[PDB]
């Protein structure tokens, strides 16, 4: 039949010795009919009360919590799953369901002892039937793995005699596609159900098998196109904090295919909310957004599948301050997948840093769906990039990319002078300043942190100065912040400074102990 996977209990641990709950003569009756049907099929077998282990049964459910707590760990039933975009179209695709899947496979002979349970007697000093499993008990720790594992082992053969047939194994289901004519396709599928039958693995026949599209893990899978199972936007007039959370949630999921989905305004609605059932009224911008999404959703878009023969193009756009959108395709607008990126790494950044980070995310994502990186189309020119890169303290790398003139283009809104500016006033800051020209202002700040006091000073200087300044400061903090040439900030003060900076012609910042 199939090999047997050697199991073991965790070290220094004995099998489960737990008392069977008192049953019912009505429930005892059913268990015995079930356990007898089963022993005639070999799945189980009466044991000699030589066995001191026991696992609770009820009505047929067997509670293996305890055994599981004592059973060795197995290799992950792998939680990584395919993304529809990484698929190559097939003409026909058949979903093969598996019944008794688990019961179909044996169990390490030396382990069965541990799977013991007892069917109580009806009369006091009469029986009290004892058994053990010879197969894979559902609810058991190792079943899913041994199964998958074993399953895998079986298809391998068939798989090599049919390199045209593609098979994905997912829990008790089994997706099988091919580029064969419906007929030869339907043929192999039986060739398969057979191969699986030689190991007594029941799969339903074509009459009952499920038909396409295939609604898998929130997707709608055909053999030539893909989408996420369509979504309905509520038309409520009263919105609960929870309602919004759920909506936002759903909205996201869309983004991997539906281009243009925004949630900034809906998200804003959560600020300060005090209970999952609190009702928040919609804002003008919020409903505008909701409607725009609703609209975008009305029209169903479907994603195309992967054609390894062709290149992968990734194209990125700035959709807002801090928002980026992208799409990856092989043929123009012939999307495989789309997506957004709002991740802000650091309290302050610039589009260059952000765009670059956006590229990494994408890159990573591709090596995973396609095992290769795409050729990028970006709204920034090499000169701008290089400039930044070249002068940033962190090592960075962007693959093959083509500048694409799609506004808004990303640029550096300002650059600090690399050397003091000749004949430009010199401000010395420590909340107040002093210039070489005699000017000064010692201002007042309340509720200000140490770090935030420093930045205030600099702001002053920037304020009162002309289009060219030299600014000396002892704050390594501030220096750092500004030297990173951010253009957006979580902090308001910064943003104000940033505004100054951009206005200037030439600015020089220096540090002193």
Residue 173 in marked binding region: yes
* Residue 434 binds another protein, judged by CB under 8 A: yes
Angle at 297 (CA atoms; ends 296, 300), nearest 5 degrees: 105
Angle at 155 (CA atoms; ends 153, 160), nearest 5 degrees: 105
- Chain positions 191 to 250 lying near another protein, rule: CB under 8 A, are none
Closest to another protein by CB, 81 vs 232, is 81
| Residue 131: strand, helix, or coil | strand
Q: Is 181 exposed, middle or buried (0-12, 13-18, 19+ CB in 10 A)?
A: exposed
Residue 73: CB minimum distance to another protein, A: 4
Q: How many helices (H) and strands (E) does the chain have?
A: 12, 26
Q: Where are the alpha helices (DSSP H) in 420-475?
A: 450-464
Of 357, 347, 409, 420, give the one whose Cα is nearest residue 378. 409
CB atoms within 10 A of CB 20: 15
Residue 311 in marked binding region: no
Closest to another protein by CB, 187 vs 476, is 476
Binding site partner of 99, from ligand NVP, another protein, none, Cβ cut-off 5-8 A by kind: none
Closest to ligand NVP by CB, 175 vs 427, is 175
Binding site partner of 221, from ligand NVP, another protein, none, Cβ cut-off 5-8 A by kind: ligand NVP
**C-alpha separations of 39 from 24, 47, 117, 444 in Å:** 22, 11, 14, 87
Closest to ligand NVP by CB, 168 vs 413, is 168
Residue 77: CB minimum distance to another protein, A: 8
Residue 179 in marked binding region: no
Instruction: Identify the residue among 56, 86, 213, 260 touching another protein (CB under 8 A).
Output: 86
Binding site partner of 73, from another protein, ligand NVP, none, Cβ cut-off 5-8 A by kind: another protein
* Residue 168 binds another protein, judged by CB under 8 A: yes
- Distance between CA 495 and CA 268 in Å, rounded? 20
Residue 99, both tokens: 């019944």
- Chain positions 259 to 318 lying near ligand NVP, rule: CB under 6 A, are 305
- Distance between CA 364 and CA 384 in Å, rounded? 24
Query: Could you tell me which stretch among 83-91, 242-250, 329-337, 449-457 binds ligand NVP (CB under 6 A)?
Result: 83-91
Of 393, 396, 397, give the one whose Cα is nearest residue 479. 393
Binding site partner of 512, from another protein, ligand NVP, none, Cβ cut-off 5-8 A by kind: another protein
- Only one residue has tokens 């007039």, namely 237
Q: x-or-dash pattern for ligand NVP, window 84-123, by CB under 6 A? A: ---x-xx--x------------------------------
Interstrand relation of 468-473 and 426-429 (parallel, antiparallel or unpaired): parallel
CB atoms within 10 A of CB 187: 13
- Only one residue has tokens 């962007």, namely 398
Closest to ligand NVP by CB, 56 vs 212, is 212
- Only one residue has tokens 């159900």, namely 193
- Distance between CA 290 and CA 263 in Å, rounded? 8
Of 377, 374, 329, 319, give the one whose Cα is nearest residue 351. 319
Of 465, 464, 467, 501, give the one whose Cα is nearest residue 483. 501
Of 385, 380, 386, give the one whose Cα is nearest residue 402. 380
Q: x-or-dash pattern for another protein, window 321-350, by CB under 8 A? A: ------------------------x-----
- Distance between CA 32 and CA 213 in Å, rounded? 42
Residue 255: CB minimum distance to ligand NVP, A: 21
| Residue 409: strand, helix, or coil | coil
Closest to another protein by CB, 175 vs 258, is 175
Q: x-or-dash pattern for ligand NVP, window 169-208, by CB under 6 A? A: ------xxx-------------------------------
Sheet of 166-170: strands edge to edge? 92-95, 173-178, 166-170
- Chain positions 468 to 507 lying near another protein, rule: CB under 8 A, are 470, 472, 476, 479-480, 483
Residue 164 in marked binding region: no
Instruction: Identify the residue among 364, 406, 451, 453 touching another protein (CB under 8 A).
Output: 364
Instruction: Identify the residue among 27, 60, 70, 83 touching another protein (CB under 8 A).
Output: 83
Q: Which residues bind another protein (CB under 8 A)?
A: 5-8, 72-76, 78, 80-83, 86-87, 142, 145-146, 148-149, 152, 166, 168-169, 345, 357, 360-361, 363-364, 367-373, 389-397, 419-423, 426, 428, 434-436, 470, 472, 476, 479-480, 483, 508, 510-513
Q: Which residues bind ligand NVP (CB under 6 A)?
A: 82, 87, 89-90, 93, 166-168, 175-177, 214, 216, 221, 223, 305
Which residues are documented as binding site for Mg(2+)? 97, 172-173, 430, 454, 474
């Amino acid at each position: 039949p199939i090999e047997t996977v050697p199991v073991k209990l965790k070290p220094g641990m004995d099998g489960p010795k737990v008392k069977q709950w008192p049953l019912t003569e009505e429930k005892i009756k059913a268990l015995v009919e079930i356990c007898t049907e089963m022993e005639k099929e070999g799945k189980i077998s009466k044991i000699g009360p030589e066995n001191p282990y026991n696992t609770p049964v009820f009505a047929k459910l067997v509670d293996f919590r305890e055994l599981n707590k004592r059973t060795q760990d197995f290799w992950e039933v792998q939680l990584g799953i395919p993304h529809p975009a990484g698929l190559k179209k097939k003409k026909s695709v058949t979903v093969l369901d598996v019944g008794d899947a688990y019961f179909s496979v044996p169990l390490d002979e030396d382990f069965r002892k541990y799977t013991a349970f007892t069917i109580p007697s009806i009369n006091n000093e009469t029986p009290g039937i004892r058994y053990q499993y010879n197969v894979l008990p559902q609810g058991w720790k190792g079943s899913p793995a041994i199964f998958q594992s074993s399953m895998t082992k079986i298809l391998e053969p068939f798989r090599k005699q049919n390199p045209d047939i593609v098979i994905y194994q997912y829990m008790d289901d089994l997706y099988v596609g091919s580029d064969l004519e419906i007929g030869q396709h339907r043929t192999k599928i039986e060739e398969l159900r057979q191969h699986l039958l030689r190991w007594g693995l029941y799969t339903p026949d074509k009459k009952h098998q499920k038909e396409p599209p295939f609604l898998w893990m929130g997707y709608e899978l055909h053999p030539d196109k893909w989408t996420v199972q369509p979504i309905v936007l509520p038309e409520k007039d009263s919105w609960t904090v929870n309602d919004i959370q759920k909506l936002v949630g759903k909205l996201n999921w869309a983004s991997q295919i539906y281009p243009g989905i925004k949630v900034r305004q809906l998200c804003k609605l959560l600020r300060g909310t005090k209970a999952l059932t609190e009702v928040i009224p919609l804002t003008e911008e919020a409903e505008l957004e909701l409607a725009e999404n609703r609209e975008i959703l009305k029209e169903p878009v479907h994603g195309v599948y992967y054609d390894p023969s062709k290149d992968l193009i990734a194209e990125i756009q700035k959709q807002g301050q801090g928002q980026w959108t992208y799409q990856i395709y092989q043929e123009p607008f012939k999307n495989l997948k789309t997506g957004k990126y709002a991740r802000m790494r650091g309290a302050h950044t610039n589009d260059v840093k952000q765009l670059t980070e956006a590229v990494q995310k994408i890159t990573t994502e591709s090596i995973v769906i396609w095992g290769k990186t795409p050729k990028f189309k970006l709204p920034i020119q090499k000169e701008t990039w290089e400039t930044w890169w070249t002068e940033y303290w962190q090592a960075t790398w962007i693959p093959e990319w083509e500048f694409v003139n799609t506004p808004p283009l990303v640029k550096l809104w300002y650059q600090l002078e690399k050397e003091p500016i000749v004949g430009a006033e010199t401000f010395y800051v420590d909340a107040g300043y002093v210039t070489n020209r005699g000017r000064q202002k010692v201002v007042t700040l309340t509720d200000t942190t140490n770090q935030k006091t420093e930045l205030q000073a600099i702001y002053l200087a920037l304020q009162d100065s002309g289009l060219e300044v030299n600014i000396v400061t002892d704050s390594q903090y501030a220096l750092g912040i500004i030297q990173a040439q951010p253009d957006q900030s979580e902090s308001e003060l910064v943003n104000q400074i940033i505004e100054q900076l951009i206005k200037k012609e030439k600015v020089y910042l220096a540090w002193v102990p």
